[PDB]
Design a protein around this ligand. Structure first.
Ligand SMILES: [Cl-]
Ligand SMILES: [Cl-]
Ligand SMILES: [Cl-]
Ligand SMILES: [Cl-]
Lengths: 316, 316
């Protein structure tokens, strides 16, 4: 047996890519995309049809250029989601424009708009996760969306404060990063070598997992962003893990059974009072890694969004 | 003539220390303190009377230990402020517990408490600045305090978003940092040498000064936190500058007249709509330096507060 097969006994495998080739190859349950993966998957010549469809559709919905750019970029992300749903039985994650990350109202609106486009294609809400950055504003947006039947993937989750706040908001799923946590520690300490169990991204997810299970929270824990297979194996037992094709390949090519690493066998414990905004802000900003990486991840995703819109604008 | 004397033609000189010796020596207009300067000034044997007075007074106001700790640490800061006001004609800046930095209500309450203690000593509000970190919550706290006749010093000002928000809130004074901005650039780029005019902290304050004057804002601009006299000289013309004794000494010992560097000679311009919380959050987090340093400065001031309270708790 190979390690990818063995992992699937303990963990729901999810493919982190916009490339349908990977869906066929690894047959994941869910898939995740983001603005940069959409931007990358756009250059694939076989996807040119999806870009043209998106641009054409946008011109049929309105006559204003600015609106056509937005409509086309949204429809493109959706169009790619639709191709992926042909090949996976579970969820597709589609990311909202990260420029809205500190705007609750705008994020709710944008989530609803992407859902409308999916619904217009005949896809139900139970096949979709809307990905938002887990700022306070994003978490509050997600809380509201869930009440309206729109399930959310709360991403760029770095601090325990973010983890706690997401759970208390009843979000469908969280995407705690692993690899970008490792990146920080390598950039800000002189320890650049870590055993898998002491990888700080692995430690973060394990602690979050424990807290979620021990309090009986339903939010799906999905580790994301990996630098190596060691990190992935150390989180075997995590509800889901979203993994890039390069690392799915490495697992598939690695022989041997693996053991479950993440479990909670105790009973559910009473929950505390909800963390307030002020408490969340204090506790998030206690974590210098999380401070840096949440803001940084948002900046980079917004740049990817802008580049996507540039590409679409040239075709109109 | 010396450079300290020459600077005073263009800029109001302020002493950044809790040490009364410096007030006598340099005869500044205002003084600034903070938890660490209070903690430092506590070890000075000649201040032991101020610590004992604070502890004694606290035991007379109440019988609860926890409240005595808070009362004593507040009274100590106030007691030091009072000794300084004997030797300066202008303002004393006293910093609120930085653990409150993301809590508007608590910060307002704390500001009012420190003002009460000063008022109880016979000091008017026009001699005092309450120093709060310029988070959104701190700015909103300051807006309200100003309306109630309590003047504020908005500190740890790093991003343009913080500057704009403070001006629009009508705060009495801002303390844009200079040296800590330089710190970040040195640590996060491979340029560790900067000409005074290209020092990123100097550039920051100069841009803020321009924006404030050009829009006729009354908020006092007071550069703070300096690594060298080059930075200070490059901001000659800034409304005020708060300077550590070490650097005041260097200026006093430096011979020669200096030129004014910071001026605005144009007419006042129309102001934009107020920045919203969401816009502020977006724009502040676009500035990786400011993201890091605002949170870091708050963490360190809170640690200094805790150490001060430890020291006070041992004496009760
Ligand atoms: Cl968002
Ligand atoms: Cl929208
Ligand atoms: Cl950001
Ligand atoms: Cl952030």
């Amino acid at each position: 047996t190979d390690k990818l097969t063995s992992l699937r006994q303990y963990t729901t495998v999810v493919a982190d890519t916009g490339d349908i080739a990977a869906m066929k190859l690894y047959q994941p349950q869910d898939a995740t995309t983001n603005p940069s993966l959409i931007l990358n998957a756009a250059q694939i010549p076989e996807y040119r049809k999806l870009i043209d469809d998106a641009v054409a559709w946008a011109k049929q919905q309105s006559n204003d250029r600015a609106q056509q750019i937005v409509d086309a970029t949204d429809k493109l992300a959706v169009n790619i989601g639709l191709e992926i749903l042909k090949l996976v039985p579970g969820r597709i994650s589609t990311q909202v424009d990260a420029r809205l990350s500190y705007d609750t109202e705008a994020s709710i609106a944008k989530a609803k708009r992407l859902i409308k486009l999916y619904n217009d294609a005949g896809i139900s809400n139970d096949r979709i996760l809307i990905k938002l950055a887990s700022t306070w504003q994003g978490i509050r947006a997600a809380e509201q969306l869930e009440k309206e039947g729109i399930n959310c993937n709360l991403t760029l989750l770095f601090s325990f404060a973010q983890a706690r706040a997401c759970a208390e908001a009843g979000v469908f799923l969280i995407s705690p990063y692993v690899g970008r946590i490792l990146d920080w520690y390598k950039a800000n300490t002189d320890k650049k070598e870590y055993a898998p169990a002491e990888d700080p991204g692995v430690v973060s997810v394990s602690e979050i997992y424990q807290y979620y299970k021990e309090h009986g929270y339903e939010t799906v824990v999905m580790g994301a962003s990996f630098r190596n297979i060691g990190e992935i194996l150390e989180l075997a037992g995590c509800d889901r893990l979203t993994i890039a094709p390069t690392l799915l390949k490495e697992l598939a090519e690695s022989e041997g059974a693996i053991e479950r690493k993440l479990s909670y066998t105790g009973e559910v414990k009473a929950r505390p009072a909800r963390i307030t905004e002020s408490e969340f802000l204090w506790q998030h900003n206690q974590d210098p890694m999380a401070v840096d990486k949440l803001a940084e991840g948002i900046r980079k995703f917004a740049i990817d969004q802008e580049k996507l819109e540039k590409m679409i604008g040239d075709l109109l």
